[PDB]
């Protein structure tokens, strides 16, 4: 095995190294893109050990109180 | 249902027999092709008679709703 | 004066000219959609317009790809 | 007719444009033959309808043959009259059969 | 040149996600990644067939001289 | 028609896989090894090259297993889904679903689960994935969110059916369960 | 045409300063406030000097790339044409299509999805 | 956002030319039976400055006006005019109060906002002066609902986003009160 | 059910409210037929195009001619140029007819 | 397609032959070239090249020393006439 | 019986502008991506929604 | 004096006298630009830009790319003018006289406190509400990438 092409289901570690020496533009492109999903799936670790999420922004119009109109309201009349 | 399945099994044999005439070979060539064809078209036969038996239970129930609708027009 | 099919005179006399006319015609349907979406103040219509631009883009590529292969065919002798 | 004339001069050395423009190339008489026939068909059709209080196969057969013969005798002059009459009688039967069958649909 | 038209429509169709990256939240982000993974297969396919390479087949051919003793 | 109890009109992806009957894995087992077998059988019916039997390349036997694996999963996925919709026998599943939903209500937790999606996106993710299995043959789509448009009445988990009194569950009223529509809009009717 | 070429060199130099080097923003806010502390804000002389500082802050940044355009021309030979097409498609595109997914992943992981204020 | 609509002035006079836009006046007034009210006469900068103080003083009246809209079932403009005057009168109350009690601090704030693109992050120093003066004359406290008390943005001691250009009057008034009031 | 008529800010536009009442009327179980929802559908198309309302304006323009009425004395005064919305025209007490600034906000 | 027939070549052949010094103005299929028209090497080449310019058919080196009659040339054009390939614009539009 | 069966199935009930099947199973606009309560024109209240029109499955 | 009309009158002329493929390509650009400009004013500014970035920036410079690989070979004036003048008589694509000659207005509302661009709404709907449209369009673009290679690549 002086320079043989590694077999992917027999030598997974050596198969990665072949495409890390001879095709640098392919190996390190995927690795940078791999951190995207990897960090996304690590969010549930952050929700408990670093800080909790912010409250959702009030982007639904004027917040309408969940009640009925107050009849007794007076003042600022005509 | 063995009466019906045997019918398909014979129909499957005839397809294999008709195939030989297409391929221009004696009808006694590789006799297993008749057994394989008979088993194959029995399998389609079993799944067909179920499909017809299943239809009858569906069609009659839809019929009942249709006769009521007809009686409204016939009134 | 459109019922006399006047637009056929305005088209060029090559296959590449036919391709242009189709894209102009499809562009007419997008400008109408943007007209309808904006006046109604509807963003569903503007989504349709975005899809029309994208879809009509792909059709342009496939047409020229066929034309380029077709044109290469005549000059495909490759003796030297 | 004028629009296709403009296309001949856009390109004529190309066989294709001249080939298919010949298919749609109406003659000089056909430019009068058709509007006369189509015009006469619509006048004769309605005129027979009023007397008969409603379109029938006989009224349409009469109109379609006379409208064809008037039309045919314009752009089919270089043919025997017997040939034109048979065609005019022939095209009358297509419309009579169409009207006997009730146009394209029986409707109600 | 022909392959520029697809990939340019891909990039120019990511504009809606730029101005709405917040409000769509996680759901838009997962959809966005799928919208690329489908287009990555297009990227993968052109990579393997070597469709981009100019290629040199018309020339640069060699052979080994072999004696033909009789 | 052979209807049954409607467990969940939009079953979740994690729950569909959980409720796989032992037969369902067998179906997945067949499909994963059926695809390599069908390639072999095709060579038996007619060889690709020549007139004699020749086993297909080992490389093809690897890809065919992958097709069978992602192919045989959906037959299991569709078989389990029909039990949720009520199209298939679900006596075994109804017992399991009612126990978990009752356990959820008893612990003052939502039956559906906490969500990262604002109330609109839950509604949006309901419409995209509901009934998607009817096209699962054509292209995949799954209900992976913890939304609440499951088309049920939660009071059907309150009354005690036969063989359930032993679980000794206590269920609070719906206005006190975390992550529910009725117990979320207490201050502003526009915001949860 | 020649004037068209060089306006791009100015524009692309300016765009690089706008996107990556903060645009007209000062190098140091301490020095920036000291200079603007000397001019009364009620006289228009303040707003003449303010524009000079912010534009000069953008100009120095844009100068370095205009210098860089000449700098690279005087130290790098020409690149064979066929390797230009095989460069962006095989190398630059996969990298630029990877940071386009690396950026949202990090921002969402720490709950920092940007908004327009 | 800045999309051409049919309700307000568009981007350029060419847009008005293509649309043949006419800007139409109405010379009438409200019918006599509808009671009269004095409209609020403040522009953008004063209101953005006083948006939270108007909220504190008029909180019960903002909600009733918006609740009336919901209960009008699409008939809001005719069925909530009486409620509409309550909000206007209460809003005029705060602007008048800020003019006779905290007049100096008020102008210092919204003049800072006019100086710095109306962005709330660019006038913290002119705002801390106004909040303290209002709390000592009108009992109105600025509050941003939804988050804890100690996470409100205007109380952050080291905000990450500071203005590029410091307002001079804001710095002078802050330092003038830096030693006098805040010994 | 999928959204239609979404305004430019993500919420319902002018004519969505009239669109919802059509959907509610049609899908309701109490109606034997769709005859009740005929006026509701006529209002939705009215909202989008105002065709009936524009017709009523055509008659009023046409009818004002036959009595000899002049649009100067019945019409609504308008200004056609956006730079000439002068403070004198706006009614400001001290205002003067100079052009207003619309070059840059 | 090849629209040339035998008569069409024969009819137009004479006009080219009427354009060169020929002993007799009567030329048909049986007429020779070197004998009847009294043409030597250089004289005969111009007429043969001239028919190449009108009939648009190239004569090879094999037939060069093997041409003896004018009927052969007329029959040769039919066996060797093709229409020049038309560009994509002319063919289909 | 064969004639009576085909008489029922081959009948085509009349559909006009008054009666036809619409496969809309809910009401849109309960939640909007942003600004859910806009001009307050959305009068339909989903808290008190009248029962919708259920489809009639003929095989059940 | 709408100067937009004059430009189209010119384009309605060079389209009739177009001879070679240079003229037809220039018709496409001379059609896009009146489209882009009339959209920049009037109706929608976002899609006036989205035209330029996609139409001109992707397809039109690909039109002239392939055209250089295709070929370069080779009534009167009163008829062309007569055709244009008669074609110009009627230019009302609609026939609702009330809808054309009557102006309208809309009333602004202050409810949408969350003002956002039209592109943000499109993203907020195309990526959530109508995700299937987006994922099919990606699938179509995938087909073209594989489609374009198989047609052209000889090997
Ligand atoms: C993972 C590695 C792997 O399993 O396949 C190695 C496979 C082996 O190739 P090879 O070793 O060079 O060829 C030697 C044999 O001739 C290769 O021939 P082969 O017949 O032995 O294998 C071809 C392969 C068939 O190839 C595939 O199925 C690949 C499917 C796409 C991935 O069939 C299989 O090996 C079956 C097992 C792999 C199934 C992969 C299923 C992935 C989930 C979807 O290489 C790849 O296919 C690479 C695919 C990944 C490309 C990058 C994708 C990046 C997308 C994410 C970026 C953004 C974040
Ligand atoms: C023609 C073109 C065609 C185009 C088609 C393109 C392809 C379409 C197919 C893909 C479908 C597209 C839909 C994607 C949009 C969904 C976005 C979304 O919902 O975001 C919210 C969702 C989070 O919101 P959530 O409501 O709180 O859900 C929390 C859990 O993730 C879920 O809650 P949970 O209670 O169900 O489970 C929590 C816990 C498990 O909880 C349990 O109950 C345990 C179950 C026992 C598991 C048994 C062993 C499993 C293996 C070990 O962990 C999990 O297992 C998560 C489930 C995902 C597992 C992997 C799914 C792979 C599906 C393929 O985002 C995600 O995290 C989704 C994760 C899956 C990634 C996307 C997978 C599709 C690609
Ligand atoms: C694969 C991993 C799937 C598991 C997962 O990460 O999703 C579960 C996670 C919810 O889990 P949890 O932390 O309990 O919810 C907190 C709500 N405040 O849900 C999440 O919010 C985590 C989001 C990560 C998954 C999105 C990225 C998937 C990879 C992209 C392809
Ligand atoms: C300044 C003015 C500028 C106007 C620009 C256009 C100029 C005119 C150009 C030619 C116009 C011909 C078509 C006219 C409009 C199309 C027909 C139409 O819409 O109806 C109008 C006319 C009469 O309609 P009317 O009875 O009045 O309807 C009132 C109902 N309340 O309908 C008619 O009766 C017209 C007669 C048509 C019937 C004979 C022609 C049809 C047969 C030849 C068709 C050509 C071949 C097409 C083949 C079809 C392909 C399958
Ligand atoms: C100028 C006016 C142009 C009107 C165009 C109308 C367009 C739609 C036409 C419908 C049929 C589509 C045929 C394709 C287009 C027709 C092409 C054409 O019109 O060219 C004429 C063509 C060639 O004519 P030719 O004699 O060879 O050349 C003359 C040169 N001086 O001659 C033909 O062969 C054309 C006739 C094709 C056969 C059509 C028959 C259709 C059925 C008619 C009879 C109905 C059958 C049922 C009758 C009983 C029931 C009613
Ligand atoms: C009922 C259909 C009536 C058709 C009548 C045809 C009578 C006839 O013989 O047509 C005359 C001609 C036949 O030609 P020929 O027999 O050779 O006589 C030539 C004498 N110099 O035929 C012709 O050449 C033209 C007449 C043919 C008419 C065919 C069109 C009929 C279409 C409707 C068919 C029904
Ligand atoms: C910045 C404006 C510069 C304008 C330069 C050209 C001005 C002439 C007017 C053209 C614009 C009218 C719209 C029609 C598109 C052009 C079609 C055309 O036929 O152009 C003709 C042009 C002039 O040549 P001419 O002698 O008039 O025609 C016979 C040539 N054998 O011959 C040509 O083929 C044109 C050669 C240059 C092509 C450059 C690309 C076309 C112009 C794109 C920018 C102009 C945008 C459109 C502006 C007008 C909009 C109506
Ligand atoms: C050299 C050879 C030349 C040909 C010689 C002739 C061969 C005769 C074969 C006789 C077969 C036989 O007997 O079949 C009999 C069986 C059994 O009938 P059953 O199931 O009880 O149905 C009851 C039938 N009633 C109600 C009429 C009694 O039906 C069959 O299998 C049916 C044959 C298949 C029909 C094709 C359509 C099926 C698929 C649908 C695609 C749209
Ligand atoms: C059937 C054949 C005879 C029908 C009677 C008929 O063809 O009758 C002569 C017809 C109809 O005459 P009418 O105007 O309806 O008679 C007066 C109207 N009344 C009686 C109502 C008052 O005339 C025609 O030109 C018909 C054209 C011949 C078409 C033949 C098509 C036949 C195809 C085979 C159909 C099964
Ligand atoms: C056990 C239950 C399943 C039945 C089997 C079904 C698949 C058939 C595989 C058998 C092995 C095989 O194909 O073997 C090969 C044989 C014989 O080939 P030959 O034509 O003589 O060629 C020469 C072979 N020598 C060299 C060995 C002689 O071909 C057949 O038998 C052909 C039968 C056609 C398929 C019948 C099934 C139809 C199903 C219809 C459903 C719609
Ligand atoms: C555009 C620029 C144009 C520029 C143009 C340039 C013209 C270049 C002129 C070429 C001159 C060259 O050096 C000499 C020559 O042609 S070699 C002929 C010499 N000949 C022999 O040595 C004996 C054999 N001789 C014969 O065979 C017959 O004499 C004959 C050839 C006439 C056959 O005809 P047949 O017998 O009647």
Small-molecule binders here are:
cardiolipin, 1,2-Distearoyl-sn-glycerophosphoethanolamine, diundecyl phosphatidyl choline, the ligand CCCCCCCCCCC[C@H](O)CC(=O)SCCNC(=O)CCNC(=O)[C@H](O)C(C)(C)COP(=O)(O)O
Structural class of chain L: mainly alpha
Class based on secondary structure composition and strand pairing of chain D: mainly alpha
Strand elements of chain D, count: 0
Rg of chain L computed from alpha carbons, rounded to a whole number of angstroms? 22 Å
Helical residue percent band of chain L: 55-70%
Most extensive chain contact? C-L, 43 and 51 residues
Oligomer: part of a larger assembly
Tell me the number of helical segments of chain D per DSSP (H or I, 4 or more residues long): 5
The whole-angstrom Rg of chain D is 18 Å
How many DSSP helices of chain L? Answer: 7
Q: Element order, helices and strands of chain D?
A: HHHHH
Percent range for β-strand residues of chain D? under 5%
Question: How far is it from the N-terminal to the C-terminal residue of chain D, by CA?
Answer: 42 Å
In summary, what is this structure?
The structure is cut from a larger assembly and holds 12 protein chains of 12 kinds. With 105 residues, chain I is an all-alpha fold.
Give an overview in words.
The structure is cut from a larger assembly and holds twelve protein chains of twelve kinds. Chain A has three helices and no strands. Chain A has 78 residues and is mainly alpha-helical. Chain F starts with 12 loop residues before the first helix and ends in a 63-residue tail after the last helix. Chain I is mostly helical and 105 residues long. Helices cover 42% and strands 2% of the residues of chain I. Chain I has four helices and one strand, in the order ααααβ. Chain J has helices at residues 6-17, 41-55, 70-79, 88-91. With 93 residues, chain J is an all-alpha fold. Chain J has four helices and no strands. The two termini of chain J are 19 Å apart. The site of one 1,2-Distearoyl-sn-glycerophosphoethanolamine (3PE) has 7 residues of chain D, from α2 and α5.
Layout of strands and helices, then pairs:
The structure is cut from a larger assembly and holds twelve protein chains of twelve kinds.
Chain G: H1 2-19, H2 29-36, H3 45-73, H4 81-109
Helix pairs in contact in G: 1-3
Chain H: H1 13-19, E1 23-24, H2 44-57, H3 59-72, H4 76-79, H5 81-100, H6 103-115, H7 124-135, H8 168-180
Helix pairs in contact in H: 2-5, 2-6, 3-5, 6-7
Chain L: H1 4-14, H2 21-40, H3 45-67, H4 78-87, H5 97-101, H6 118-126, H7 131-152
Bound molecules: cardiolipin (2 copies), 1,2-Distearoyl-sn-glycerophosphoethanolamine (5 copies), diundecyl phosphatidyl choline (3 copies) and the ligand CCCCCCCCCCC[C@H](O)CC(=O)SCCNC(=O)CCNC(=O)[C@H](O)C(C)(C)COP(=O)(O)O.
GO molecular function (chain H): oxidoreductase activity
Protein name (chain H): NADH-ubiquinone oxidoreductase
GO biological process, one term (chain H): mitochondrial electron transport, NADH to ubiquinone
């Amino acid at each position: 095995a002086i320079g043989d092409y590694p077999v992917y289901y027999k030598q997974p570690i050596r198969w990665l190294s072949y495409h890390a020496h001879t095709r640098p533009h392919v190996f390190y492109a995927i690795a940078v893109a791999a951190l995207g999903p990897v960090f996304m799936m690590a969010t549930p670790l952050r929700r408990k050990f670093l800080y909790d999420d912010h409250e959702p922004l009030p982007a639904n119009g004027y917040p309408l109180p969940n009640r009925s109109r107050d009849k007794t309201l007076t003042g600022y009349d005509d | 249902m063995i009466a019906s399945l045997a019918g398909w099994g014979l129909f499957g044999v005839t397809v294999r027999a008709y195939q030989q005439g297409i391929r221009k070979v004696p009808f006694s060539y590789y006799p297993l092709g008749y057994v394989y064809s008979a088993l194959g078209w029995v399998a389609f036969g079993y799944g067909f008679n179920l499909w017809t038996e299943r239809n009858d239970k569906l069609l009659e129930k839809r019929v009942e709703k249709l006769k009521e609708s007809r009686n409204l027009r016939l009134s | 004066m459109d019922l006399i099919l006047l637009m056929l005179v305005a088209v060029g006399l090559n296959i590449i000219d036919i391709y242009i006319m189709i894209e102009i015609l499809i562009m007419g349907c997008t400008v109408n959609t943007i007209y309808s979406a904006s006046l109604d103040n509807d963003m569903i219509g503007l989504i349709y317009s975005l899809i029309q631009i994208i879809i009509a883009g792909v059709e342009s590529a496939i047409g020229l790809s066929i034309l380029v292969n077709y044109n290469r065919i005549r000059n495909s002798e490759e003796i030297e | 007719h004028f629009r296709r004339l403009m296309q001949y001069k856009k390109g004529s050395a190309r066989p294709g444009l001249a080939k298919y423009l010949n298919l749609f190339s109406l003659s000089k008489s056909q430019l009068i033959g058709f509007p006369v026939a189509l015009g006469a068909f619509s006048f004769l059709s309605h005129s027979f309808a009023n007397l008969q209080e409603g379109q029938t196969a006989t009224g349409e057969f009469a109109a379609s043959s006379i409208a064809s013969l008037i039309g045919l005798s314009i752009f089919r002059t270089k043919k025997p009259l017997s040939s034109n009459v048979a065609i005019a009688v022939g095209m009358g039967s297509l419309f009579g059969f169409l009207t006997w069958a009730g146009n394209f649909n029986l409707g109600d | 040149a022909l392959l520029f038209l697809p990939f340019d429509l891909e990039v120019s169709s990511m504009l809606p996600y730029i101005v709405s990256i917040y409000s769509v939240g996680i759901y838009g982000l997962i959809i966005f990644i799928l919208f690329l993974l489908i287009l990555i297969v297009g990227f993968i396919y052109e990579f393997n067939t070597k469709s981009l390479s100019i290629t040199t087949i018309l020339h640069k051919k060699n052979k080994a001289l072999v004696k033909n003793l009789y | 028609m052979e209807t049954y109890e409607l467990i969940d009109s939009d079953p979740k992806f994690s729950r569909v896989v959980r409720y796989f009957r032992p037969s369902d894995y067998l179906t997945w087992a067949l499909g994963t090894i059926g695809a390599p077998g069908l390639m072999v059988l095709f060579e038996k019916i007619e060889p690709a090259k020549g007139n004699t039997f020749k086993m297909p390349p080992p490389s093809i036997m690897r890809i065919a297993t992958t097709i069978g694996f992602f192919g045989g999963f959906y037959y299991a996925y569709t078989s389990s889904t029909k039990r949720f919709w009520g199209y298939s026998e679900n006596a075994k599943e109804v017992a399991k679903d009612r126990y978990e939903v009752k356990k959820a209500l008893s612990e003052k937790k939502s039956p559906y689960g906490s969500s990262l999606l604002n109330p609109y996106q839950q509604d949006m993710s309901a419409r995209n994935s509901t009934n998607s299995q009817l096209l699962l043959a054509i292209f995949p789509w799954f209900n992976v969110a913890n939304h609440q448009s499951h088309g049920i009445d939660l009071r059907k988990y309150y009354e005690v059916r036969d063989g359930e009194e032993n679980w000794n569950f206590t269920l609070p009223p719906l206005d006190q369960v975390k992550d529910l529509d009725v117990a979320q809009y207490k201050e502003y009717s526009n915001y949860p | 045409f020649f004037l068209s070429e060089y306006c791009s060199m100015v524009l692309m130099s300016t765009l690089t300063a706008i996107f990556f080097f903060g645009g007209y923003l000062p190098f140091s806010n301490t020095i920036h406030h000291l200079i603007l502390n000397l001019f009364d804000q009620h006289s228009i002389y303040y707003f003449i000097i303010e524009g000079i500082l912010l534009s000069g802050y953008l100009a120095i940044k844009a100068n370095f790339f205009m210098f860089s355009f000449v700098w690279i021309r005087a130290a790098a030979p020409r690149l064979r044409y066929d390797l230009l097409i095989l460069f962006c498609w095989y190398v630059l595109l996969p990298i630029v299509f990877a940071i386009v997914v690396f950026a949202p992943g990090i921002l969402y992981c720490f709950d920092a999805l940007p908004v327009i204020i | 956002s800045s999309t051409h609509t049919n309700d307000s002035l568009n981007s350029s006079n060419y847009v008005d030319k293509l649309k043949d836009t006419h800007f139409v006046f109405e010379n009438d007034k409200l019918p006599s039976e509808i009671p009269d009210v004095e409209e609020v006469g403040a522009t953008t900068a004063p209101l953005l400055s006083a948006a939270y103080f108007i909220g504190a003083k008029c909180q019960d009246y903002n909600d009733d006006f918006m609740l009336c809209q919901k209960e009008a079932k699409g008939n809001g403009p005719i069925d909530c005019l009486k409620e509409g005057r309550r909000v206007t009168r209460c809003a005029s109350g705060v602007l008048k109060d800020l003019n006779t009690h905290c007049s100096d601090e008020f102008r210092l704030h919204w003049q800072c906002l006019s100086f710095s693109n109306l962005e709330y992050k660019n006038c913290r120093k002119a705002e801390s002066l106004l909040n303290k003066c209002v709390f000592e004359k009108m009992n109105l406290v600025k509050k941003i609902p939804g988050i804890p008390e100690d996470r409100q943005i205007h109380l952050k001691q080291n905000p990450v986003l500071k203005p590029v250009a410091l307002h001079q009057d804001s710095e002078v008034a802050f330092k003038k009160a830096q030693n006098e009031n805040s010994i | 059910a999928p959204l239609q008529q979404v305004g430019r800010h993500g919420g319902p536009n002018k004519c969505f409210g009239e669109f919802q009442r059509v959907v509610e009327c049609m899908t309701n179980a109490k109606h034997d037929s769709y005859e009740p929802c005929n006026n509701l559908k006529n209002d939705y198309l009215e909202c989008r195009k105002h065709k009936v309302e524009r017709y009523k304006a055509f008659l009023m323009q046409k009818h004002a001619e036959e009595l000899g009425k002049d649009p100067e004395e019945i019409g609504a005064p308008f200004v056609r140029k956006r730079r000439f919305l002068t403070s004198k025209t706006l009614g400001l007490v001290d205002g003067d007819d100079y052009e207003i600034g619309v070059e840059k906000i | 397609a090849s629209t040339l027939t035998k008569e069409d070549v024969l009819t137009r052949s004479v006009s080219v032959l009427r354009g060169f010094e020929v002993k007799t103005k009567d030329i048909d299929l049986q007429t020779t070239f070197v004998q009847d028209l009294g043409m030597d090497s250089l004289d005969l080449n111009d007429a043969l090249v001239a028919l190449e310019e009108e009939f648009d058919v190239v004569f090879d080196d094999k037939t060069a020393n093997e041409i003896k009659t004018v009927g052969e040339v007329v029959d040769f054009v039919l066996a060797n006439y093709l229409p020049t390939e038309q560009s994509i614009n002319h063919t289909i539009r | 019986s064969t004639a009576d069966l085909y008489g029922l199935i081959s009948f085509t009930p009349k559909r006009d502008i008054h009666h036809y099947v619409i496969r809309v199973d809910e009401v849109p606009g309960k939640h909007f991506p942003t600004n859910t309560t806009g001009n307050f024109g959305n009068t339909v209240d989903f808290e008190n929604l009248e029962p919708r029109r259920k489809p009639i499955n003929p095989y059940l | 004096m709408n100067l937009e009309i004059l430009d189209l009158s010119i384009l309605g002329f060079y389209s009739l006298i177009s001879s070679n493929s240079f003229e037809s390509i220039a018709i496409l650009v001379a059609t896009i630009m009146p489209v882009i400009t009339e959209l920049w004013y009037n109706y929608s500014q976002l899609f006036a830009l989205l035209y330029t970035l996609i139409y001109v920036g992707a397809v039109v410079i690909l039109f002239v790319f392939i055209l250089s690989v295709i070929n370069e070979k080779e009534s009167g004036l009163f008829i062309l003018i007569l055709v244009l003048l008669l074609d110009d008589l009627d230019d009302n694509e609609s026939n609702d006289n009330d809808y054309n000659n009557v102006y309208i207005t809309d009333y602004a509302d202050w409810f949408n406190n969350y003002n956002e661009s039209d592109l943000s709404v499109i993203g907020n709907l195309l990526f959530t509400e109508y995700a299937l449209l987006l994922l099919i369009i990606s699938f179509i673009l995938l087909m073209s990438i594989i489609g374009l290679i198989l047609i052209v690549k000889k090997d």
